[PDB]
Amino acid sequence: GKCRGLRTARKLRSHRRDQKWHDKQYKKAHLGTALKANPFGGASHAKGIVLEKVGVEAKQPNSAIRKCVRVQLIKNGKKITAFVPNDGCLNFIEENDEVLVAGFGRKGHAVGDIPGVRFKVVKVANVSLLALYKGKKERPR
Amino acid sequence: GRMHAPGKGLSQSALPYRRSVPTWLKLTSDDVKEQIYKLAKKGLTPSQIGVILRDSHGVAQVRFVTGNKILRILKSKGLAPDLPEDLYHLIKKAVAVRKHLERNRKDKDAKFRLILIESRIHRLARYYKTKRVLPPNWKYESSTASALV
Amino acid sequence: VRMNVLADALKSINNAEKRGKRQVLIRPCSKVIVRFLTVMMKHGYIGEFEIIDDHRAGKIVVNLTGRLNKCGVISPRFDVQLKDLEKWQNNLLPSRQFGFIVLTTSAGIMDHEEARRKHTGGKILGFFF
RNA sequence: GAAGACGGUCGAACUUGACUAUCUAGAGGAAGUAAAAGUCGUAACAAGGUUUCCGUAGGUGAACCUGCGGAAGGAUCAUUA
């Protein structure tokens, strides 16, 4: 059992501090290894250059081709595959242009049937993908 | 339970409620003290003195008759051993097992028991040094253990 | 080994009350045990008890009125200030209508209501309800 | 009482010696990870068809096989004067 003594504060504190390193979230957020492995480097968004368009096959239980783009981030030069969310939105993206890419909503985890993809395109050529999708804005000439 | 065994025994003396000298004891306190001195001069420990007084002459408790314990009486007149009797017996047992282990180096149970005995000796010696019964530099050593027995 | 004889006494009383017994034998006795039992008995929870005098450390036979739900010890005996007493009562007592926390204060061993009446904090001994 | 090396002090710098951790380049070798009945070929799950498993040693054309000791999480809570 746990120690219950008036002078056990150091033991309890040290045990809690040592046992916190067996928490996945705590170790991830405090070790700093997941931070250097993060392509965004702790940022919420990033800007990259579209290297090519790629279609990744959906995971086994359902069949589809997910329209993604392989982008290279400007801050660190890292290579990134980002999902282009809506339909026809891959046609709004051209090779070798700037795109603003955010996370996929699971904090570095793959989302849904898309395998090994944790980033999504938010803006292309400094205009949002939603404005292009809804026709509120056209691609700059 | 025992300090160095898994046993949990309930064997020990049960002192009676009455702290008075028994009616059958015509021996006054001074005769009891004289017999204690004689038994100590014969070379007996306080435990043996109490056993003999309880067994042969008949003394329920020396403390209830003389008002002092046997070791205190011996120290008062001055007949007590230099080192305490229980520590002396522990050192004697350690010396015995160490002498046995010399010609029985394959006896790995004797080595374990000797470790336990020396742990008991160290604990008792630390307690006695705390209460100034032993000199503050009193140390137990294998090469000097038989010098104390 | 046996430390905190008050914990043993209170656990024995609780276990005997769960079993539905009319008397419990507590040993060893102590001054703190007697004071805790007296505080319990003033509130009608435990009834009369007798201290058996063996010449080493007393035993107590406690009559048991079926009124007691739980008696417990708090270990270690935290020092409790009068401003932290309400938090202790919320943590330990079933309601604000009944149940007592027994503190040991320089004014003696008494319940939390008396300790607030005498404007004393102290060290928490236990509770009963 | 107005410039300048010298019993000296604080001391940025500067080349030369080891060759310093956060950084990068190649055919490599070993391994991990994602759904894919992928050309005679089944270890485990039933006694899984040699009961399984642990430690340790060898050997294998792969699951694996074998020796020694152990466990039942066994397929026996039991076997008779």
Add this chain to the structure above:
RNA sequence: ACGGGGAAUCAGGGUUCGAUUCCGGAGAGGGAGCCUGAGAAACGGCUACCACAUCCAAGGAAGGCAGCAGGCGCGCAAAUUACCCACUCCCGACCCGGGGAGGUAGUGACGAAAAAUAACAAUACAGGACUCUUUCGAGGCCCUGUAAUUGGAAUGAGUCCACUUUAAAUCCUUUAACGAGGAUCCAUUGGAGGGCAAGUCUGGUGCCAGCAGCCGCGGUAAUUCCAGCUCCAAUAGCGUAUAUUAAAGUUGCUGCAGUUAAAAAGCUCGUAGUUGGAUCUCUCUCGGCCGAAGCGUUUACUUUGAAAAAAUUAGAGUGUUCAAAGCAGGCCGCCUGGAUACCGCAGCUAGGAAUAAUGGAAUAGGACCGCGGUUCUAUUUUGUUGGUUUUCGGAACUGAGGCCAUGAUUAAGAGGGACGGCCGGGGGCAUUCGUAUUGCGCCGCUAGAGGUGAAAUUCUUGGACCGGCGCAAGACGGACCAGAGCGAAAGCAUUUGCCAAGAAUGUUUUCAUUAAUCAAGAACGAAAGUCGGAGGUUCGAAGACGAUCAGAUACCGUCGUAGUUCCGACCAUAAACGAUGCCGACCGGCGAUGCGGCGGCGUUAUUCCCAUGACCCGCCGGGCAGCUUCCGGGAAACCAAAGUCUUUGGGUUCCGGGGGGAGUAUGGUUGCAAAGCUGAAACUUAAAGGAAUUGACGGAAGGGCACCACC
């Protein structure tokens, strides 16, 4: 990582954050060294070097925006190269000058407060509303609204006037003139399967495109995609990505868990750490209730009293038009406010003494009394000062004696030790014995034995197997042998002897808290394995053959090497398991069993006087177990512990945090080696897993049945 004040939920407790306007510190591209000065190691001062960089007539000269604005760059990420000293203050030789401090500003959705996008009909309607007389019938009495037939009233968004405001000004406020009927003066953002509020309506698409945080939707009748309509959530605001808090009792102090789900170290000693049994209710001065003076044994508490910046927070008052705010506001010149609380811990002060503690007398080396015996003397005198005035508010050498009720709590169903009779496959050393197996030597034959349900290898007129006499080697210790005993665990079984140890029991013995658990360290630690030396029967990894098989070089068989055995030195690992740490209390019953003790009818054995040994019936203590469990607990299986748990705190050690990657990589450390100990991450995944329930299946058992089975 500048620190703090402080900031983000309120259960209580906490977890994160604090570059950032207040306080303190530091720096002015990086270092270093200085002048002046009260104050600088100052940079809107200087001198160098380093890195950048400006003009040059190429001799030289001049640099420091982490000040206000502005550029570039970096980026997901942040404003105008504006006006003014009118306010707040600061500086100066100063009432007067100056201040990108500071104050004031056409595109700041960081965020916070208030708050529009409408309020009122005849009418048909689906209605209902106080006894409705009628399903065919008073329904501006009360309310809702499909509305291509209505109607007036209200008002600010906006545009403008009056300069209120202000240092010229914009803004709010104020007054005027226009300003609303699809009041087109037209609200959006995300959703409509569930979680989660709201359509299995229609069209298109047809596992495509896509949706989907998760589960899932889509493979021509999609409640989920693309759309139309309709519906609902918040609303001038909604969605998304990240960090963070609560949810998370999934870090558990409150308050988790560790038999089987992840998990108690193989075992035992052990230092630090943590925790620790009862017990104690002319001492002192002015006036026959006061300041001083306190070693009461220091403390820890608890309760006070001072000192703890403001702002923030809590909170009192005060109609900002309400509110966020602010510190302010009326009365035919006077009244007020500008509070209070909290401000951890650590320091300072003051009652009573419960409760970790600390225990002042034990070779008495322990108050109070007569002695001053050489000495300091109200800082030696006390008529005109005169050496010498011994003990009455102190200091050493201590020679004597006395009321000290003279001073040692108890003896833990705590522990150590002694003693007694026992007890045990506990350990070491030596010594006996037993068959069996394998060899060997002799004595008697068909020409067979071995081995597997007939699939072989394996000797031979050199006689195998078998039977009988012996002999020799190593190995082992059957039956007795048990849910029996001993040991810390690993483990331990032939006799006898020696050596040391041990539990329990018995004890009116002794010591008297000496204790529990334990980082660091340490001893032991099955088997296998390693290095030396013996030995080498049997079995036997490797290996060699022989075998039904589709394919063994597997299972089976015959051989067989290291090993298996012993003696040294290593190794330190096991499903080292009760998959259950240890110490201590309490909580049911019963029958046994091992050991010790105690009591008792009787039955049996050593000459007929007794114990004692073997039985019998009981009681007590420890131990290995056999138990319902609706005491109780658990998810249950089950457990008298795995109970005494939301009615949650006896003490303490180790240890787990979804599944994989992985006990892997790397570093360290040990080892001759094999390997041991400590031990990640990137990445990947929606489950993996535990208990049990039904079925199905089993080359699983029991019992039956059928010529769509067999015989």
